[PDB]
Symmetry: C6
Subunit: 257 residues, 6 copies
Amino acid sequence: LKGGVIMDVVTPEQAKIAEKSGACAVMALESIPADMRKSGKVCRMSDPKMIKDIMNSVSIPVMAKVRIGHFVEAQIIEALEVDYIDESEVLTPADWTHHIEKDKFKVPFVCGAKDLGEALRRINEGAAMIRTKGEAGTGDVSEAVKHIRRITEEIKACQQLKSEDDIAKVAEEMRVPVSLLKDVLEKGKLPVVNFAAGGVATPADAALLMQLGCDGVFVGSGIFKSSNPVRLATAVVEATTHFDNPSKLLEVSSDLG
Amino acid sequence: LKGGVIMDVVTPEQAKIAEKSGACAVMALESIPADMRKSGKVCRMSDPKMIKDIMNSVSIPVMAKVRIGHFVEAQIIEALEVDYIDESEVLTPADWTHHIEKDKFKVPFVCGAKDLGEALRRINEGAAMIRTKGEAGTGDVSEAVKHIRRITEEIKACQQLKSEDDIAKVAEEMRVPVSLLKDVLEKGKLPVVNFAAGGVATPADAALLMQLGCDGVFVGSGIFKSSNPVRLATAVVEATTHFDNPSKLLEVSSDLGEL
Amino acid sequence: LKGGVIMDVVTPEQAKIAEKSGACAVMALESIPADMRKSGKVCRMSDPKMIKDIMNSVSIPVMAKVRIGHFVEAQIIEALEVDYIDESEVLTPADWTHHIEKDKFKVPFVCGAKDLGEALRRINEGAAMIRTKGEAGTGDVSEAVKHIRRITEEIKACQQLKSEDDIAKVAEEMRVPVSLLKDVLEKGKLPVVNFAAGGVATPADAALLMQLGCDGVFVGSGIFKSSNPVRLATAVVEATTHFDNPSKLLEVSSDLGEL
Amino acid sequence: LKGGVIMDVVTPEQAKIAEKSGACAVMALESIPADMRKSGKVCRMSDPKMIKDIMNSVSIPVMAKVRIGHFVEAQIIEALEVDYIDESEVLTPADWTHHIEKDKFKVPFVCGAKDLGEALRRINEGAAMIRTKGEAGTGDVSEAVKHIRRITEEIKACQQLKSEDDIAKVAEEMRVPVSLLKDVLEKGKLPVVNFAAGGVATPADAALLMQLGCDGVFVGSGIFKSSNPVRLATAVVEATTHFDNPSKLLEVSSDLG
Amino acid sequence: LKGGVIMDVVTPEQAKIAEKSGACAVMALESIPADMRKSGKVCRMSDPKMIKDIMNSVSIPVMAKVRIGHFVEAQIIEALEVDYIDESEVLTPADWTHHIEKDKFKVPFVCGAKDLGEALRRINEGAAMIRTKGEAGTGDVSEAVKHIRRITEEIKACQQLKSEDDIAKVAEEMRVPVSLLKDVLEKGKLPVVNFAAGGVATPADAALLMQLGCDGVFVGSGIFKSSNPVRLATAVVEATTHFDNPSKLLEVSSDLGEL
Amino acid sequence: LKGGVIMDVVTPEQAKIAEKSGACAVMALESIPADMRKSGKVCRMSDPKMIKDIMNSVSIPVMAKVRIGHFVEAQIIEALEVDYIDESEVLTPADWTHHIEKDKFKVPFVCGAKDLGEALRRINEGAAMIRTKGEAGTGDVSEAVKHIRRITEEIKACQQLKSEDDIAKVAEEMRVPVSLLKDVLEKGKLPVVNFAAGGVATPADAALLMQLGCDGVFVGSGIFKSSNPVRLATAVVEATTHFDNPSKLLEVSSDLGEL
Ligand SMILES: O=C[C@H](O)COP(=O)(O)O
Ligand SMILES: O=C[C@H](O)COP(=O)(O)O
Ligand SMILES: O=C[C@H](O)COP(=O)(O)O
Ligand SMILES: O=C[C@H](O)COP(=O)(O)O
Ligand SMILES: O=C[C@H](O)COP(=O)(O)O
Ligand SMILES: O=C[C@H](O)COP(=O)(O)O
């Protein structure tokens, strides 16, 4: 999925628009967890029937969300044969102490992170992909920028440590194996891809996060609330592909409505 | 009641639906205390007439609630010959210092607990069953999860203690006999069953708490507020039974309707 | 009055219901102070005309209330020839430092207390009867329970003191003569009767307070706000008499209507 | 005015009811400073025209109010030939540091006090009469009780001091001459009369304050807001006169409406 | 302007009433800042056209207001040939650190002050007149009284200082030259006139402030909100003139109407 | 641009008014950010179509805004061939740690500053012009005044330092090269022009900021919300040109209508 865009969709017809626009994958969900999160409601796993109806409408991979720590929601979604599971902070947490033991599943997981310690704990638990936490539903890109900047800074700062005993102290505070931290410092990057997510609203935002070093982008239900969803979706895809070309970015950004 | 579901019911017709869906017992209550706790009202024992009309309508066991410390409410319910009494934090407490002396009744009691100390105090007073406190009426499973995790953890932490003097110190703080704590540490579990309660909303939630080591499940009035109550009740019963079979859990979770 | 129920009444016809239901006395009042507390109003002694009209309607004793420290309100009520005076915290206090010199009157007084020191000060001032304070008008029994439990706990705690000098120090702090405290510690009880009051809502509540050691029960205007006042009044009287009979308590508690 | 009742009145016809009921004096005022004090308004001296119209309607003495420290309001009221001036905390203060120099006037002044130090400062400034501050407009007698109890207690406590140097220390803290304090301690009372005021609502209240040692009572506009003002006014007068007679107090308190 | 009254006016017809009543000057303003200060609006210099239309309507001197620190607003008003400028705290401040350099203008300025230090800083900057700040729009005279009392008191307290080094210390804290402070202490007064302002509502209020040692009086838009504006304005003028004649003060205060 | 006025415009017809009134440049924007700040909305770069439509309407320079740190918004606006970019705090910031690397662009940038350290960091990053921050949309000039006064005060304070090591310590704290701070202390000014911005509401406000040492003036959408926009725009241009002429400032400030 490297270099691609993943789009949130709430109906089979929305999924078809995403596919036609050039999305790499879709995220199936029954409710927008930003509308009812401001209603006070509890947000859970979506009904397996609505997820299956979306799986049957497109040929590209389909992802679905589960609550933090809800390993039974994950068992059910795995049995449904989805392509990826997102253990998501946007839904209402089920366990405020323990995340899912992701290394007991065959299906790959994506998790959010806002700093280096969080990213490594999620990977140690078994995550196959990392993304920014951002701030979902607001359309403010600054959160996602903060998280990618912070991870990059913390890797460079640990690389300046000359004492192996000092490195071991850092790993202990992070609650991860010293061998995982040492691997990051040798490569100068996380062992898995890191995608942008939360508050990506415009084609310019998508290109900004790619220039900052992200491997792809997630976009939310904001796409389908615009005056012309097809045009906006297509523009975000083009901007992610051609992220280093100012003339193309100008072209796709003009007269968006 | 090991491995079963107990359902809150407010009418005789609701009790019949619970029985048909495969519930192991029903809890009789005249009003939902969660709906009242938002108005300032005092919530007490239900009228014995409404409890009896429910007892007359089903052949499965029937439970009823009393206020914390209200031993006369409990004497009345025992005389009515209900099957179990819940000394409940959801009702308005009658005594803020002392709980009921439960070992002086014939009928068994269930009590709530959030940690190991609280569980052991309720058992020492005479409780026959323990349950999580959770957060009643919210539909959020996370409080029930917190409580089962905490009890399990505090047992393991006390098992690491090498000094018998330190163990006696712990029991003193808990205000329980040292012999009760020692039995728990040797067995690795409470001496009575521990059920999930408060915030169980979906079949997946019921199976989650059974996988965490609960012995059964209490569910609330949310069942009867859904678009299809009999379908939801049956699905919760099936998930509590088949709690570690993923193909069955997918089957019962599909096309559930609006919760 | 011992073993009996005293009922608040606002009209002659309410007094007649109380008498027929088996009350031992009535308390005459022109306004429900709990209704007037919500209005921010000052609550005082009732008009002597309305009290006299109640006195003429029944052949059981009649009590009336006065503000804390208002010795002139008490002089007027004594001249009217009422049977007892309640120096009451439910009315708006008149003197925040000094209570009435009750030993200068011929008519007996009842006073409220929340702990042992308070009870002994009221007795030293001249009170003939003590009652719990509770929380008047809320229908929550927990405050009356707290007060009776406290007094009992403080007596037991003082009974553990070995030094007479230490006992003398406690009496000085309480502002009462040492001879009064000594009598209480020898006999394990107050020298006058102690009734339950404030927040007694159901027959079960009345029997609970009698089992905790109270000598009788005061009930408020909640009786006459229920669906069937005569039925509820009679049930509270029966529960106070038969407080240690679970089968009888079940009988009178069933099908009571809305409370 | 010893043993008498002074009544607040807002019209000439109200003044006539007060006189017929047996009042010793009336207090003339255009507005009730409890209604508009809860409206946020500034309360001042009343119009000299309305005061004169009341003076012309009755034969008994008439009093009027001025703001704390407003010595020009007092000059105007003195020129009008009223019988007494009340420098009153119920009106909006004009000077939050200095009270009126009352010893520069011919007309006598009444002032409020809540403790011994306050009472002596008001007398030192020139007051001819003291009254309780109470709490006006509320009908709660407890304030007035507090103030009479406090003055009595503080006199008795100073009388227990055996050192004349200790007495001088007390006077210095009170900001009054040592010879004024020493006079009080010798007599066991203030050198001027002390009346009850603020929150006197019923005949029982009036008798209570007289039994506590007050020399007379002030009553407010509550009288004229009752169902039967003539009956209530007459009952308060009888209760003040016969303050130590329970049978008479019962008689006047029955069927008041 | 010694011994006179200055009146706030919002139209040419209001200015004519002020002149006929005996005012010594008028203050031209397009809106009452007290009515706006409750809405959050920015209050600035008035439109020069409205100020000129007032100047054209009367033969007495005319004043106008500028924001604190706004020296260009002052340059515009000076070019218009108004008679006096008020650098006013009632308008929205333009500079929160620095006031206008008033000694660089030809037209005289008036400034507000709450204590001796503040008065001396305004004089050092070049003010020709001082006034109390009071509390504008409230009708409460007590703030104006506080300010005149404080200045008078702080002068007397500084006069008790026996050390010239201590005097220099005081001037340093005030941020003024020692020669300015010393002149005040020797004379027992400020080197310029000091007028009452903010909260003057009645004729008695005007005479009160003159008896306290003020040199004249500013009055606000309250004059024109009364039932009879010409009667009230005339009475305030007469009381400011005859400020220590009680028979005259009684005469002008009688039958004033609703304020 | 030096000595001139830059005006915010939301349509081609507004741009034409600005040009005819004598503006030196226009700032193109699709929404008034002050109106959108009240709505809680995110404010971003404007649509390139609306900017181009304004570019086609006038023959004076056109500027456009981007979010703080949003270097891709800046890349797009540069490709459009606008004349200047404003990296603006009035839009919703994109990067709360890092501003744009402005020296990597061909198009010049303007940035805001509230003190000397901030001004020098923006210049070191590559800014061609500095402006005050002020308080955008409120019409209160005091914040722009505060910022210009601060920068001047801090230059004078640093000029008093005798030690080169002390100067080096100040530069380290500011996070700028010592050579940049040294140049400012020698010449008594910034190396680039500094314009007034934020809260400039009247002609008098514009002239005030020019007299305080600003090089030119930015004005906001308040111009086009007044009764007569062309009249107000022309008056602000004339006041900026003739800032030290009191008779001219009186002329253009009179009879302006509602603001
Ligand atoms: O990834 C680096 C960005 O492109 C620019 O950020 P910077 O201000 O740290 O140079
Ligand atoms: O009972 C243990 C659970 O099934 C797994 O939880 P955990 O691995 O996060 O501790
Ligand atoms: O007065 C004793 C009560 O009946 C029971 O109280 P307890 O629970 O503390 O034993
Ligand atoms: O003035 C004394 C009162 O009549 C009674 O008050 P007391 O409680 O202090 O005795
Ligand atoms: O200027 C002094 C006043 O006229 C009187 O005030 P005072 O005696 O309270 O200090
Ligand atoms: O920049 C100097 C200003 O024009 C006047 O300021 P100032 O009042 O501090 O002298």
